[PDB]
Structures are given as C-alpha cells and as structure tokens.
Subunit: 481 residues, 4 copies
Amino acid sequence: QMLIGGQWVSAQSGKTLNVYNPATGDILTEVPDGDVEDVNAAVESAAATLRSDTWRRMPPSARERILLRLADLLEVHGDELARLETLNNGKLLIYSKLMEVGASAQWLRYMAGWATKLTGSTLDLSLPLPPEVRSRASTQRVPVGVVAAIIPWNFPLLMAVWKIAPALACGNTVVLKPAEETPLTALRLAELAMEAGLPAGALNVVTGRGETAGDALVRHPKVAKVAFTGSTEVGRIIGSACGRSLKAVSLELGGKSPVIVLADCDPQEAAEGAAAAIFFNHGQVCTAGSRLYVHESIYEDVIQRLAVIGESIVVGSGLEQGVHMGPMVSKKHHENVLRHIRNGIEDGADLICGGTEAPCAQGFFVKPTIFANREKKDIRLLSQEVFGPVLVATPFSDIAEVVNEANRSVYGLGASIWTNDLSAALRINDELEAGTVWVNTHNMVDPNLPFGGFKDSGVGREHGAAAIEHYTTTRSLVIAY
Amino acid sequence: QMLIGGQWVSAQSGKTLNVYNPATGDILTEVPDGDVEDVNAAVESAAATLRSDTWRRMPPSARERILLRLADLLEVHGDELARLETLNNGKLLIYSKLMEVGASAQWLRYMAGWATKLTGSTLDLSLPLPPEVRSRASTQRVPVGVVAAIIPWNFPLLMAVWKIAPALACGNTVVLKPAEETPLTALRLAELAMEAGLPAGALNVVTGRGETAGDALVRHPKVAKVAFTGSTEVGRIIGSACGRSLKAVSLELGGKSPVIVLADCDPQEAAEGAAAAIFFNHGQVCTAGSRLYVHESIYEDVIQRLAVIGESIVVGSGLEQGVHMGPMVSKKHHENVLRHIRNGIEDGADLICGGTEAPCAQGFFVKPTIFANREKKDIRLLSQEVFGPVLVATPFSDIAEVVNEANRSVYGLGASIWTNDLSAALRINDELEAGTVWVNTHNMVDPNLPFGGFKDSGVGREHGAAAIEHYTTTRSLVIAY
Amino acid sequence: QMLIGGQWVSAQSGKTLNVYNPATGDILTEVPDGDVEDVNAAVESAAATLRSDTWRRMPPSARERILLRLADLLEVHGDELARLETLNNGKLLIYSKLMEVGASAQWLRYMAGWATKLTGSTLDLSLPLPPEVRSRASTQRVPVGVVAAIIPWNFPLLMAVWKIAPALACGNTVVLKPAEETPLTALRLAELAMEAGLPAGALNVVTGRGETAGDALVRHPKVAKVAFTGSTEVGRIIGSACGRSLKAVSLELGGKSPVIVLADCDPQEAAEGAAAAIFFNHGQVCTAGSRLYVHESIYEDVIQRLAVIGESIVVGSGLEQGVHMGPMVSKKHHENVLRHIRNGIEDGADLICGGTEAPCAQGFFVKPTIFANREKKDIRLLSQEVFGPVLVATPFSDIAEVVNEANRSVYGLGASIWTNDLSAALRINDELEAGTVWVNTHNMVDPNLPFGGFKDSGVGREHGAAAIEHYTTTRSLVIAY
Amino acid sequence: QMLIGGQWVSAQSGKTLNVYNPATGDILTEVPDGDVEDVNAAVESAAATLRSDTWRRMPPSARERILLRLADLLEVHGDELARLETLNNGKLLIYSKLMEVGASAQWLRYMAGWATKLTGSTLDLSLPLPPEVRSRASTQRVPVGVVAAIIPWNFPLLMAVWKIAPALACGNTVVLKPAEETPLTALRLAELAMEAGLPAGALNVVTGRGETAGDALVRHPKVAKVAFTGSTEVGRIIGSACGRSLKAVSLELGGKSPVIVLADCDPQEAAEGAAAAIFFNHGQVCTAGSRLYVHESIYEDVIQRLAVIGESIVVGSGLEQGVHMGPMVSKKHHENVLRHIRNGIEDGADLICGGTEAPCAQGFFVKPTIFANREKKDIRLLSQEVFGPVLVATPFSDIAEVVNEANRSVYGLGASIWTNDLSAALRINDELEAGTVWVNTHNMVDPNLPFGGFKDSGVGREHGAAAIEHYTTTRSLVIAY
C-alpha cells in the first residue's frame, strides 16, 4: 500500500503492478499502480504540511532528532531491510547491509547535522539613504517547498536517502517515487520515518509505472523542485517541463567514466583497480569505469591480469555464499546489456573475458565481460552507457592522447588516474572534463563530497555543502530605521 | 556596429535596424540586425577564448585589474555614457550619471573583488579504503563556460554590468544581447572593456530584433548558461529550451510589488514613500510598488497627499532642467501602458491623479497615474504588470488580510512594510511570499545584496555571494595515496 | 576518583578534599586533591592519544557517533545526573533535567554534526612561477592539540559539555578541571564518554583546589589551548601566562548586564521580564541582568510589580516541591553575596524587596533582593558583579543617557531592550557595547549562537561556527608542478 | 617627521635618531625618537576617529575605494618608493619595484575587496520561548578597534601594507610603528594614504627606538589588538603583556624552514631550488630555507652544483647593475650573522662556499655561505635563526628520519619537499609540523593564502580569509517578538 498522509492507502483505481526477484525471476509481490489521482493527493498533502506550523516552525533540533532517530532505526531494522534489498534488487546481502543500510544511516546522520547549521548572512550596503538614517540588511535561508523525488533502481534504499535526507534537513517536505522495478525499501523507509517522529504528510511515497506516475509528479503546479536520476534522455523531458514551469531541477544522468593507467603504475594494482572500478554493483553505477585506458608499455600485462580477475568472479543469488556478483535488476535491462555485448562482438573488439552465455538457469544474470580495443577502432560501445558489467580496454601512447579520448564523450561525470606521478596526475585532472576525478581509486562517495557531472551527465551538485544550497533558497530583508 | 572577436563588424546580411530617441520620437541611429550567422561567430569566439590559456589561466589579480580599470573608465567616460543613456532610454540625465554610470562602476569594483576570492573546500572522508591508505579530498571552483546574456531596456548600462561584471570575475566569457530598443551603451561598454585590458572574444555584443537574435543565442550548443531578464512569458520559452538543453539558467522576470502602510506610520512619510516606490524610473522597474495598501484609518489622508505629489511631477525630456520624470522607452510600451490605464477606468477605479492624456507633444510620455481602489474590488490593474507609472491604492482592516492580498499574486519579487512596529514588521515579513522585503524603503539594490523572486518572478539569485554560486561550479578531486 | 588514561585513579599524595551540599551544608562526599603530579600524567596522556593514530585518523563519522551516543547516554542516564547536580549545586531538580541534562544533550548533538563538516579552502594564486608552471594551493583545517578546560560552578554538567563537546568534535583531546565546589557531574560525564566509545586518554578529568591544580594545567608545556570561565581577575593571571607561553586562550569572564525598559513597553511584561533576567539560576549567571533601567514614566509602576514577584519567590531545597529558587553553591559565595547586599544598604539604596536575613535554617540561602536606586547615585553595587539574586533598579529620562549608563561598565557581555519600537531597539543595539544583545528576552543561549563579551568580559567567542574557528587552526599547502 | 592626526609632527622632546644606508655605511637621514608622550597622542587620535561617525559609518564601498586609490598611488609613485627602499633597506632596486611596491599594491587591492564582503550569519534557534513567540537571531561582524602595528625591517613597505591593508579594510584604525632601522617607506605610505582619501587619525605612524616606543604602544589601555612580527623572544614579552591586558594579539615570530630533496628529484633543479629558497632577500626572510636535507644518493651532486650557484652571486649596492644580492640592514645584524658563520666553522662543519671575509669595502655585506653537515652533528647552526644568507646542508637515508629532523625544531613556519612522488610528497606533508608547506617551490606568499606557523613561530594566521577573522569580531543579536 503506499503512504499518503500517514496513511497506508491503495490506488484509487485499485489497479496494481508486479515487482520481481531478479535471481529467480518471479513475482515477489505487488504494489500500487498509481496515476494522477494519487500523485495529486500526495502532493496536496505535502503542501498541507509544509505550510503547517508544526513543520514550518519546528525548532531546528527537533528536525535533527527525527533524522537521528531514523538512522538509528535503519540500523536497528537492518537485517530486514538488507534481506529486502537483496530480494528486490539482486544485490549481494553484505553490500545491502553495508552500502544500503549502513551508508544510508551515515547520510542521515550527516545531513541531520546540517538541520541546525543553516545560515544566511548579515550585510553592509552602500545605498545610500538620506542622512540620520541607517539600515540593516540580511538574507534568510528558507526551504524550497514540496520536493518531487524520483529514484533509480540500482541502490533503492540509499538513492532515496540521498534525496529525502537532505530535503527533510532543510524543512522541505517530499513526494518520493521509487523505480517500478524496486519499490519495497522506500516503503519501509517511509514507515520508519514516522516511527522516528516525522509528521504525517512530510514524506509521501507514490508508486507506479514511470510513464504516468512520474509525469504527474513533474507537471504538478505545487511541486517546487524536481530531483531526478536515471536515463539521461528522460532527464531532457524533465528539464523542458521544469523550465517552462519555473521550477528548480536536480538531474543526475548518464556516465561513461574513463579510467587511466599511466606507465609507472603497478600492473597488479591497476587491474585490481579497474575490476573494482567496473564490477562493483554489477557495473550498475552511473560512475562505473567502463572505459579502460592503459599505456602501451604495460597494456597487455594489465589486461591479462584483469581477465584472470573477471574470469574468477562467481555469479549467483545475493543470499548465497561464495558469490561475488549478482544479477541485473530487470529483464529489460538484462536484454539491453546483452545487446550491447553483442554489438561489441560484431564491431570487432576482442572478447578476452565474458560473452552472452547464461551463467545461471534462472534470472537476469550476465557474465562479466571485457573487450579489448587494440587497434583503436571506435566501436561505439565506447559511446554507449551499458550499466552492466562490460568493459572496453584501449591503449595509448601519449598523455595528451588519452585526455582527448576521455573527453571525447558526451558525458562527464567521473574519472580515475592511476599513478605516483604528481605532475601528471594533477595536470591530467586539470584537463579532464569530469565532475569528480579520483586518483588511485574510483567510485568513492561521501556525504561530505559534492557530486555531479558536466555536459550530458546532468545539472547540479548533490552532497555536502552543495546539498544545502540546492535544497534551500534565500529571502532578503532590508530595514530602514 | 557590433563586437565579435575584437572586431567591429557589421551583420552578414548587411541588414540593419533603427534605434530612437524616445523624447523626440526620431531615429537616433542604426545598429546591426543580426541573425543566426552572427550569433554563431560570436559564440564560437567566446568559446575560443574561454579555452584560451591567456584567459583560462590568467592569474586572478589580472582579471580583478581589468574590471577595476574599466570601472575607472566608466567614470572617466561618464558624461558621454550618461548623455548616451538619456538619449536612447529617456532617463533623466542625473540618474544616468548616478544610477547607470555610477552604480555600474560600483558593481564592477565589487565583483572585481571576488575574482580573487573564489574558493572550494578541503574535506574529511569516512570512505573507506584499506588501512595504510590515506586520502585527500577537495572541490575546485571553476567557471561555467560561455554566457548568453540578454538585457532589458530600462537600465541598459547597469543591467548589462549586472551580468558581465559577475561573469568575467568568474572566468566566464560572455555573449551579450542588448534590447533592441536600447543597444548603444552596451556597445560603448564593450569597447571600454578592451581599453581596460580584456582580451578579444571575452565579451562579444550581438545586436538585433529579439525574436531571432535571442533565439539563436539561447539554442546554441556551445552556450553554457542563459541569463535573461524581461517578460515573464518569454522566460518560460527560455526555461523549456534551456532545460532540454541541460544548461544553467538565470531568469529575472515579472512582478507586482505591494507596499503596506500600517496604522502608526506617519502619513506624509508614507505617501512620499509610495511615490518614490512607483514613480522611480517612470515605474519601469521590476520591483516597482504598483500595489499600495494603506490602513483604513489613514487611507484617505495618505492618498490625498500622494496625489499632491504626483500632480506636481513635471514630465519632460531627460536633458531639460526642471523635469522629474521622462518617457517610456518605446512606442509599443507607451501604448501598452496606456491600455492598462484605460482598462482601469472601465473597471471602475477612481482616477485621483493621472490619466490618458498626453503631457507633451512629441514622445512616449505618460502622466503619472493613481487609481484608488476603494471598495476593494479585484479590477485588473492589480494582476497586470504595467511597467509604467501607474498605481492602484487599496485599503485594509486587518494585517492578515493585507498579507493575504500581497500574496494573491502570481509573482513574489519584492515588498515594503512601513511601520515602527517591530513585531508586526517582522511578522509580516515572516508571512510574505516575496523574495526581497524592504522596511521603510523600497527599490534598494546593492552589489552585496542577493536579489531574486519567488513564484512567477523567476529562478535564481543575482548579486552578492549568490552571483558566484551561479556563475561558478565545482569539480571534485579525491586522491588515494 | 578521577580519570586519567581510562583509569579511575586516586591522587598520588592520597590527599583528598570535601564537596558539600548547599542546602543542608554537609559533606556529600570527597574527591581527589590533585597536584602537579597528577595534572602531568593527565596531560601526558592526552598528548599520547592526540598523536594516537586511532584518534588522529579516526574517520569523521566515528567521532560524530561518539558524541551522538553520549548525548543518547546523558538522556538515558538523566534522572541520576539530574539528582546529582541538584545535590552538589543546589539547583532545582527540574532545571537540572532540562537545562543541564537536556541542554547538554542538545549541545552534543549539535557539535557532533560539525565533526563531519570541518573544511578548509582551495585557492587561486597570482604568484608568479615561471610559465608552464602551474600550482594548486589549499588550507587544511586541523586540531589545536591538548585542551586545558576549566569549568565554573554554576552549571557543572553543561559548562563542561560547552567545552568538551566542541573540542572533541574537532579532534582535540582535553584535560578538564571542574570547580572544587562541584566535581561529580563531570566525573560521570567522563565515564559515560567512554561507554559511548571515546578512547582512553581523550578526556581526562583532574580534580582539586583551584590554586594549584589549575596553575599546573595552565603552565603545562604540552597544553595547546586554555579555555577558562570564572573570576575576571584569575582570567588575567591565565592571560599573562598563556601569552608568554604562546598558547591559544579562551576566556569567559565577568558581566554586569543591563536591562532597559522603554516608555511604550508594558509594565507587567517588563517586571516579569526583569525577574526572569535576574532570578534565573539564583542570579548565578554571567549574563544576569543585575542592572535594571526603567523609563521615568513607568518606573514605579514597574518596580512595584517586580517586588510582588520577588516577594513571592519561595527559597528552598532543590528536591522539594513548591520551591522556585535554591541556594548558593558555597559558603564563601554566600558570604560575599551578603556583603554586597549589605554594602548596598549602607550606600543608600532603597530595599524594596529582600535583604540579609536567612530564609532557611540550614544552607547557603539568600533572599531575592531588589534595590531601588532612585536619585541615581553611583552606589558602587553598580560596578560589582554579585552573582547572586541582587538587582539595582535605576530610572532614566533620555535614551542617550541610558545607553551611556549601560556602557559605563568595565564589562560588556550582554544586554536587553524591551520595547516595541523598531528604530529605538535597533539603534540602542547600535550603540551598546555589549557582545550579545537580546530584545524582549534575556539569558537566551543556543548551540548555534556565538557568545562572548567585550572589554573585561573576556577574549573570544564560544558557540556556533565560532567554536570551530577557535578549536581548529589551518595549515597551508602550495604545490608547484 | 611623524604622522599623528593628519599632522606632520616632531617628537615632543625634540629628540631624534639616525637612519642609515646599508651599502655605504652613512646617515641617510633622521626621524623622530618618540616616547610615551607621542605614542599616546597617536593612540588617542585613532580612538577618536574609530568612534568618528565619518569612519565608523563610512559606507563600505568608500573604504574599498580608499584602498583602491592608494594601490593606484603606490604604483604611480613607484620609482620613488622603490629608490627609497633600496636606499634604506639595501634591497635590490628591481625587487623593490616588484616585491615592495608591486606586491603591496596587490595586497591593497585584494583586501580592499573584502571591505565590501564582511558578513555575519543569520541563525536558527532551539530556545524555547513560550508558544506564540517567535525569534530571529544573528551575528554582526564589527571592527576590533585601535590596532598597534609593529613592523620588521626586511620588507618595510610590504610588511606594513600586510597589517594596515587588512585593518583598514575592516574598519579598524591603526597606529603603526616601523623598525628603527627602516622608517621612511611607511612615512610615505601614510601620506599617500591621506592623498587617497583616508581621514586624519585613521593611520598614524609613530617612530622611535624599539625598547620604548614599542612598549608604550603595547601597554596602551586603548590599543585593542597587537600585530607584531620580529624576534620570537620579544614576542613572548608582547604575549605576556597582551594577555594580562585581555587584548587580541597577532604574532609572526621566528623560523628554521627545512627543505627536503628526495631521491628522484633532479639535482640541478634541487640546487637551483635550494639557492632560491635561502639567498632570496639575502636570506632575510622568516621562511628562508636554512636547513637543506638531501638524500644520500644525490647529496654530493646537489651540493656541488649549489656551491657553483652561490660562488657566482655578486654582492653589491642595490642600485648597481650586475648585482644579485645586497646587504644586511644594520650593523648589529651584520655582526650577528657573522658570529653565526663563525660558530659554524668552529663546530666542525664544512665550508664549501662563502665565509667571513668582506666582499666589499663599505657596508654591511656578507658573502653567501654554505656549510655541509656531513656527519650529521647537531652543530646547532640548525638551531639558530640567522636571517642571513647561511645554509647548512645535511644528508639523509630514510624519509622517516628527515621528517624527524625537520620537526626537531622549536619553530615550524614553513617547509619544502622536492619530488615528483605523489605518495611521499603528500605524506611528507602529513607528518611535518609546519604551518605552510610548499612542494617544488619555497617562499611563495599570496594575498589569498593564509600564513602562520606552529610552535615557537607564533600565534595566528595572516592573510586571505584568515585576516578577516583576526581583524573583526562579532556581536550577537537575538530578538524575541
């Protein structure tokens, strides 16, 4: 049932839709197939509550304490939420416990401490009013309003914290739509939010097929900001709509993160580096390093080792022991990931590791695949975001060459340099058109580190002290006395 | 003639268009009627130069010195730029010297100051990586790219500074389009920019009819941000376009600023207050206080005085002595302002001052007009932005009612409260949905005060420390060592 | 016992000293009478631990968690800590629960959230190295070192959490000395700190007579900062010592807060206002408003009411029901407070309420006393901090003279204006030489509000974002490549 | 003469003292030998003016414009001020023009832009007053008061700007005492300050022997902050005095900056690196890298080259062509520098370059001297700040040993690492106890980079955004409405 107004409610049509277990591939359950009737209640309920005095004028340590008490309840309820994720998403249970239950609790805490530290400024001003007059001028940080939150399916619990945590800190209320392939952990989130002391209406969860629930949410006259993450294309649709609506928009869209191994870097470290950069969360990560660039000198050395690493990954259920990777989240994405593997074989790249052969009997499983692009043929899997465990590994002679190739992308979100060369590392980072460069790591995210991309990877920044500016605004006040 | 690449250049079609003096309704001159050929060159020239190592890697006190030198040349060339404005815009010469030549120079200085003070952060990190592996994280403030700047016709020199000053501080380059009713002062601006040491291509000025030059600028794949101010409608067009383009957008659109006189406020100090709130810049100001709300008790007292004040305004040429108000900027706006005066007489409001008759023989002149909305009827001089010297003055009994009326607008840009009452003043400001409240003043703008509106008045904030956050972005860097 | 290194330890001399109960003035218990042997162990133990990798390089959400769990354990152990305070300090039990157990938990939470948000900057640089020589420059927020914390006896739990909470957030370790009249609640604090996960040595508590334990702490070569609050005189001893030592110093010394009632303010509200301003905490508060200034017009009206209010205060034990005020903390302070009452009767002021007679049979009890200084004599009780429930109430004609009188003090910590006059209120605040003005309140302290005084009331600010800058410092880093 | 109140004034005793040319040992001129009569006038004059409404309530772009117009007059009067320095200080004329006239103008500009951007905060609050009562709480950045500025003799114009520029930006007034070996450029500074529009009394310059003028300045009851730089000893004296006075103190004392050459760094770059690190400003620089540490492998290679470099430095007058180094500033410092060279020969170090013989016939000239400490003896030329062109060069085997040696100093002001190893460089910087590490450079100072040292090198930070926290403070304001 969904949550709207403190109330577990079904869809007004009494229509419904199936969620699956991606390992076996069967129905796990049902959830409500909501439409524009039920986005509306939910958005009118948050606007009710944003104006309520009990939320608007809630002292600031009380809103810090709600977010504190729920991080305390994600961790107290954390075996159950972790089995839940693994069930719905396919993800390895230990990673559900650590990176979804546990990183989620960490983001709450962090953002909960902002609730109490939200400041404007106190200003000088050369006006200049008549004499015998004086003036005092300030800005006042205030909330943005009702937040439309649309979450992607790769990290359902977390990617929902990543929006609600910072919106609630600010004094915004939210209407949250989880992906249709994964709604269960946000439903639990919402009811633990209320156990922690969050007033009815402050966090509503609407469920449904993306085509319609989504659209209704975006095009609502009482929605003040839209925080989307997903397909970079649908992000354009949201953009257009939000801009003629004059509403604030947060957009985290696609990536084709490159990873760059310089001459002096150790081959065992580089190939262990690359594997972690792209087989983490089955490659289902905006920032996954799907383009590997290794220097001419150690190129083969590196890709040899790397195929040993990927050959030895065991694919299986997320609750089984001995398993390193799990499945894709849906059967449409499984089919899309396999079509890209397949265009890659036809485009003349070298399959060193992987293919399209099903690792299991049931489920949306893909084998971890590596393509070697020796001969620098721009197959265009160098352009395609896959969002699955697929790597293309190309070589390079100069550093100027690799930099150019890294920035021959339409996306620009992340990147890695692997090196103990200060000059180079820092001067590659100088020239990369990437919004979050890592050096001798990849995929590292923190509640205090802002995140966003350049180009076609979105508009805006996500965490840290960037959150606060994007979930707050100011009003000015100038008093002549 | 227009500027593109350090070069005074005509339009490629050779086509041209007339600018006028609004006082003696005559051609003043001609300027280029540019099209999508010449937005193109200009936008490819700024992108050439933004990538320029000269500009990208210009030390930060060198970019501070260009903006300082040119505030020093706005003031050294300031009789000429002030005659220019008055000629093209209609504005009173002393106000050209003070509020266009002199406030601009002040803006430059101020923003030139933040050139040198643009910072990112240095951050903790709870990651984590293996033991014996330590990390450093930071963000780095960087420029947004090529700036599309579209300027309104009410304050041609200043409104242009308001954008170029903060974009250039940041390391952005700009392509500036002035209104078609007023291009001359931005042309002079551009050539003084180069006398001050600004490299060719850093500030291009394209001219033309808004319908086409504008559109080309907005829809250019190499334009990184769009800073528009004008009709709130056209802003919606820009919004849509910018959001499907994934580009940052600055929008300062309409208003209908209310001004509120409480019971205890002196009555002549209120009427002198209101007159300044709406006859400043012949009411041609986004924030002009076009709705007057006075308490029941002193309502008549106040509007009596106020009509004495407006009756005694002398309308004339901007270079003549004895003149208090000048003209409208164009004949289309003159005609629109007169149509609103006229709907107001038919909608049953009381003309206590002003009207539809022409004060002068030549020119786009309007008499300052006051309508009394005794009876508290929702005619339509209340929901329509006039942008001319027209006031509707309504009464009110409670403070809750006036607040409600102030926020029965589709815009929330500014507002005034007039009072010695701390509680009330501060608790009105609490409840107003206005982005910049003044108390015992109106229309006060600083370089250090952020400015923006709520609702239909735009997206984003403009000055102060809000300008750096809107003309910069960050890239993250995390080094594992 | 006292805490040093995770260890409950007695003094090396075996010497000991009595703590008492201010309400029945008998021994409550004994605690260590530590000397320079046992300041030394304790300060060598914090320096051991500050250099500890575990503590220095503790991830930043782990240090946030410790402070969060221990706010969670002040509140879980909160009836016991509240009985403890009331026992040792004399304070009313409800206030112990609310303003010592409960404000302390609030301060933890708040500062615990800064643990994770401590940032430096990332900077531009006009240098200027050779060409082809690019550089990146940052500052890095780091901890100050070992903190010597000396706490006053009026709010033992809280005043301790005022210092340890912000030092531990920062990554500083601390050596805490509580007053000798009140050590028990900081001893409990220290052991709950360890139950919450604080490593041994991070918070040591040394106990003893102020003369010697104190001095040893201040003059220790390994103490990096000194945070003192108490007698403004002893503060100058600490000053001298700290400055020849080249150590950072926090000093919160004396006050003589004035409170100002303007003509228009309501008499019942003003006198209820003043009573709360000076009978809160039995007047044992740096910021207590011990000077009352009321306008000529309503002066008598106000002081009449006020004596009704103070006459009706019931003085008694802190655990008894029906009691509004409790005792002084020690018998030396009781005797000093009574000597000032007595000086005041001889100096010719009018006792309108209270006096020198003992309300109770046992204990350090004082009656709440009001002196009417009609005639405006420099009855030099207007220059003496009492720190007890004693008020002098003087009248005034012009606002310029009240402002003069407010700033005829050697202190400048706090002040109140009572009025509903915007111009006057803001403008008085303009001219007051006070570090924290309140308007229509007094004695209001937040975790987010900085606190400090001017003149003889100290050096430095205490809370908010002022804490972080006083408990951190920066190192710069400039890399040429 | 001296400046006090806009007035060029002689000392009250009529007593006077000689200033010298350091190249040709001769009187250059005379200046006032002021005493406690004339510190007093000067400090009573700044306090007159700080309270001045003209200065206190000077709009903030007017104070920005004074500092702007005087950077513009440092550069317009810049051949003369540069001949002046060279005359009085001994410094090479081109460096007078570039690093004293020109860096000084840069510092003005930079700090002048912070005049305009000085902000407090606007805060939330968990109070919690009754219900029905709302509150608004802010801090307000204000100036510290009268500034006692004592300047060192190595960079007379600049070191003076370093203080006055940031104090005046803030709204502080200053009383400036230049060294007694160099007063002329601050006298010119002061009169150009007034040509730029600085009101009389805002910058007074008192002159005299350090023993007495200094003391009077420090111990003045109306001096609010003391900004000293010089002997670390005298800094202790100031410390003690300032702390019993309860006044803010800025102290930039001594350094023994180490410089560290790792195995992989190029020998000619390292030795060119070290020479610049210690023969810049004739070694008369707090941060001069007077300890050289080179790895075992390339140690000899490096010191060979380095002696070629120092052997080829030509010592001479600052206005002569072909000269690379000039003289010491006084004959007492010349004699002290030569005594340290001489203890170094007796302590058994290897003179590879330079010595004790006089390069010239007249003047305070020293030859650039390098001592090789093979054998790693604590000769203690490493424990003594020379402030002259003297280097000790020691070798080292592991990186842990060099780090230990770098932090076997009583001062930790600056340091250099030379390498192209990212791990090591970052890490070395991790473990150094130095307040400003450089990598592949040394001696680099910006207006935007904070500067200060650890240990015995002082208290506080100097530039950037650290200035504006040290030259401002806040007052809090909480309004209950």
